[PDB]
Design a protein. Structure first.
Ligand SMILES: NC(=O)c1ccc[n+]([C@@H]2O[C@H](COP(=O)([O-])OP(=O)(O)OC[C@H]3O[C@@H](n4cnc5c(N)ncnc54)[C@H](OP(=O)(O)O)[C@@H]3O)[C@@H](O)[C@H]2O)c1
Ligand SMILES: NC(=O)c1ccc[n+]([C@@H]2O[C@H](COP(=O)([O-])OP(=O)(O)OC[C@H]3O[C@@H](n4cnc5c(N)ncnc54)[C@H](OP(=O)(O)O)[C@@H]3O)[C@@H](O)[C@H]2O)c1
Lengths: 239, 239
């Protein structure tokens, strides 16, 4: 089992914390060559070093701030990747901003715009930049991260709900365009023990939640060979 | 029938052309006091004058460019409305930008951002500004405009599909927050004979399409009293 992802090159955004960190570390343990994207340099250095402890292979990391990056910035990142890696076998878009959790009448419009910029616009721009590398895979897998409020909007979820709906739509468009070329799917992690969840639910007991490690089976499956015919779908990590 | 919307004050965005123009004119014919929002001053003047021909009542219009308006701009507009109108009984968010219809790899990121800004962000900001007026209605009705690609993403629909998914999500959040206070719903017009449709489908015969006038029954129903218990739903004008 331990070589499930041997010779698969997988890029993970939001790899500096929470679910993305766990995904990057888990993929590396299963033999993948991982590329870490994040915003916080110190956190990325820490994750890369912990992957080196666990696997003896030190992954490369890149800084890309999704709030402010331009299309040119994403293209430049892709060019830097091309120098060291001949393809991408997987891209996991896990980075996300929660924004305000409060009624629509109280949503801060600057924060609303930021949520849309990171979760949707920059996620799209990065996708555009990385598509040529993904198409070089024998069976590239592109994964977006949704939420239950990306399937059914609920009170107080504001920009986050709008952005995760947009994410499902973007995934569906891409799956349709890349039939028999790429697998394109969404994962809904479910409520998971991270800082984002704790901010969204400040009074909930985090010990009642599954951890990122607990929800990894779906993350592995989508990057492995058993999911090869599956595209255009949204999967719940906690069904 | 001709006084169905007597003493209902209804604001319509994108009232300068296409479906929005038809909705504004139709609501006025049924007795509504209509407020026209658009970008093109000459078109708004023309629609207001044609409403005056048809009803002998000249509606007010306001310019608000959804690409560049700030939250402050929307608040200022709401203040201007408050001067002349004590409430809003309906708000129809019909304005929209199509953006590029082409594969994801060819989508222009500036255009993508514009589509998200008009269809989602400024639509949200305007909603925030108008909510207090809507809450003054005995039964306020807030209507967003979706598309079939806001329910199922398809190839080439890019930012537009993402934005209409976000629109469905925003509608669902609002419906949940305003239970037994407002009706909040989406209309999917279906393929309708307008300039937007003709650009999206340049080779299609527009005479094969229903016109905006043809799809008005649903637009009237959502503003009239027979839809009073209906919220959180998306309705197809062409089922
Ligand atoms: N935890 C849950 O219950 C839950 C449920 C449903 C969906 N999700 C989704 O799961 C994904 C991961 O979230 P999480 O719970 O693991 O939260 P998290 O621990 O706070 O991690 C979020 C990650 O996103 C990155 N990120 C945020 N803003 C960024 C920006 N401007 N530029 C680049 N990267 C940015 C962060 O990077 P830096 O630390 O380097 O700033 C961090 O690595 C998100 O898409 C979230 O919506 C989580
Ligand atoms: N026609 C269809 O087959 C179809 C199908 C599904 C959904 N829809 C939806 O129906 C709605 C109406 O579209 P339509 O077909 O009637 O197209 P249309 O004739 O081109 O009308 C679009 C309206 O949106 C307004 N608008 C565009 N950009 C704006 C901006 N930056 N600021 C303020 N207003 C702006 C335009 O105003 P100005 O003219 O003043 O610039 C125009 O009044 C849209 O939401 C569209 O997505 C249409």
């Amino acid at each position: 089992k331990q070589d499930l992802l041997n010779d698969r090159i997988i890029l993970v955004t939001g790899a500096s914390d929470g679910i993305g960190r766990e995904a990057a570390m888990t993929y590396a343990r299963y033999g993948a060559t991982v590329i870490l994207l994040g915003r916080n340099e110190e956190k990325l250095r820490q994750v890369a070093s912990h992957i080196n402890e666990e696997t003896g292979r030190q992954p490369q990391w890149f800084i890309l701030d999704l709030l402010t990056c331009t299309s040119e910035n994403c293209q430049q990142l892709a060019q830097r990747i091309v120098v060291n890696y001949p393809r991408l076998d997987g891209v996991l878009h896990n980075a996300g901003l929660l924004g305000d959790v409060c009624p629509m009448s109280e949503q801060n419009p600057q924060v609303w715009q930021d949520v849309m910029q990171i979760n949707v616009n920059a996620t799209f721009m990065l996708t555009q930049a990385l598509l040529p590398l993904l198409l070089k895979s024998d069976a590239g897998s592109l994964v977006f991260t949704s939420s239950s409020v990306g399937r059914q909007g609920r009170a107080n979820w504001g920009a986050y709900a709008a952005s995760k709906f947009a994410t499902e739509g973007m995934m569906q468009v891409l799956a349709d365009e890349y039939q028999q070329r790429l697998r394109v799917n969404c994962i809904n992690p479910g409520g998971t023990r991270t800082a984002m969840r704790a901010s969204a639910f400040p009074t909930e007991d985090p010990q009642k939640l599954k951890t990122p490690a607990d929800i990894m089976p779906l993350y592995l499956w989508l990057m492995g060979d058993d999911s090869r015919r599956k595209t255009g779908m949204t999967f719940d990590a906690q069904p």
